[PDB]
C-alpha cells in the first residue's frame, strides 16, 4: 500500500545565492522513488504527487557556512505555498556543519508539487546523499 | 485508512513564563484534524486520541530568545508523563530563531492526551503557522 | 497491521571514544517492539528486521560535550553502510545540551541490520530515556 520516495542530495556544494533560482533545491538523486505515485522534475527540483492522498513529507538540509546572517532557513512548499519552515541560527566566520530537519503530514491532490525552497541568503549547502535529502510517504487515501 | 492531524501556531510571540500555564502550548489552529480519531482541547492545549492505536507523534517549536539560562527545552508528554524530549543550545542576549523538532512512535489507549510542554525558563517562542506545529498519525490498530 | 519499535536510552552519560566500539550506540531499552519484525541484539546495538518491507527509521541523540573538534555527528547505518547522517556543530569548550534528530524512509530485505553509529570523537552523549531514542515503523510491504 504505502508508496515512498527518498531523494538524496547529489553533486558538489550549492552556494545558494549563486547556484539556485529562487532557492529551490534542484539536484536530487532518485534512489527509491515509487513512480506509481511520485514524479521528480529534475530541472526545477519539484516533487509531484500523481495521486490524491495523505502524505507525510520530510526534508533535511546540511548547512556548512553562513556568510553574515546567523540564520539559515528553508520552507517545504506545496504549489509554492509554504507548509513547513525550518530555521537554525549558526555563527558565521567559521565552518559550522548542521543538519536541518523538519517534517509533517498533510492532504494533497493529484498533480500538486512539493519543493524544498531555501530562503535567499549567502548560505552554503553540503549536497551529500546522506545529510541532505527530501522524501515522502503516501500513507493512504485522503478523507472523502 | 490512516487518520491524521497537523496543528499549527496561529498567534504572535509567546513569553513562556508569563503567557502559558506550566509551559503547555495551547494556541493551536486545526489545519487538518480527523474528528473521529482526534480532539483538540483549545484551552489546555491537549490533543486527545478517541480510539486505541499505533500513533506517530511529532512536534516542532520555534524558540527565538532565551534569558538567564542557555538551555531551551520541551517535552511531548502523554497524560502529563514525558515521552519525547527536545533540547537545544542558543545564545542569550540576541534573537536567534531556532526550530526544535522531535518525533516518535508509541501505542496509546482511547482518551489519552498529548501535549507540548515548554521547560520553565525565560524563553520566548514564535507560534508561527509554519515553524511551530504539533501533529499525529494513527498508523493503525495497536498490538493486542 | 503496522509493526513498530521504539528504543530508548537506558543508562547515564556516555563518552564516545572511551565507552563504545566503533561509535555504535548499544545501551537500548525495548518498550514497544514487535518481536516478529524486529530483533534487538543488545550487545552490538543492531536492530535487525526479520521481514522484507517499507520502513521509516528515526533516531535522536543528545550530545552535550565535544572536545578538541567542534563537530558532533552520527550515522544511521544499514548493514554497516550509511543511510542517514546527522550533524550538529557546537562550541568545543563547554556543556551544551542538544538533541540531534534525523529520519527517513527505505526499503529493506529480511536480515538487514540497522544501527546508530557515532563518529569517532571525544563526544559526550546523554543516553536519557526521553532525549536519546532509536525507532522503526514497518509501513507495509516493499515493492516486488
From Swiss-Prot, chains A, B, C:
Changing residue 13 to E: In STHAGX1; decreased interaction with EDAR for isoform 1; decreased interaction with EDA2R for isoform 3; changed downstream signaling. It is found in: Secreted. Coiled coil: none annotated. Changing residue 45 to R: In XHED; likely pathogenic; loss of function in positive regulation of canonical NF-kappaB signal transduction. Changing residue 25 to P: In XHED; likely pathogenic; loss of function in positive regulation of canonical NF-kappaB signal transduction. Changing residue 112 to H: In XHED; likely pathogenic. Disulfide bonds join 86-100. Changing residue 43 to C: In STHAGX1; decreased interaction with EDAR for isoform 1; decreased interaction with EDA2R for isoform 3; changed downstream signaling. Residues 3-139 form the THD domain. Changing residue 112 to R: In STHAGX1; likely pathogenic; severely decreased function in positive regulation of canonical NF-kappaB signal transduction. It comes from the Eukaryota. Glycans are attached at residues 67, 126. This is Ectodysplasin-A, secreted form. It comes from Homo sapiens (Human). The lineage of its organism: Eukaryota, Metazoa, Chordata, Craniata, Vertebrata.
Amino acid at each position: 500500500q504505502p508508496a515512498v520516495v527518498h531523494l538524496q542530495g547529489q553533486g558538489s556544494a550549492i552556494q545558494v545565492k549563486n547556484d539556485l533560482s529562487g532557492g529551490v533545491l534542484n539536484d536530487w538523486s532518485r534512489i527509491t522513488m515509487n513512480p506509481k505515485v511520485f514524479k521528480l522534475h529534475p530541472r526545477s527540483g519539484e516533487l509531484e504527487v500523481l495521486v490524491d492522498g495523505t502524505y507525510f513529507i520530510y526534508s533535511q538540509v546540511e548547512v556548512y557556512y553562513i556568510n553574515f546572517t546567523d540564520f539559515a532557513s528553508y520552507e517545504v512548499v506545496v504549489d509554492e505555498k509554504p507548509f513547513l519552515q525550518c530555521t537554525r541560527s549558526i555563527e558565521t566566520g567559521k565552518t559550522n556543519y548542521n543538519t536541518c530537519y523538519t517534517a509533517g503530514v498533510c492532504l494533497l491532490k493529484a498533480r500538486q508539487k512539493i519543493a524544498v525552497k531555501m530562503v535567499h541568503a549567502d548560505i552554503s549547502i553540503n549536497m551529500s546523499k546522506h545529510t541532505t535529502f527530501f522524501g515522502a510517504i503516501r500513507l493512504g487515501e485522503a478523507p472523502a
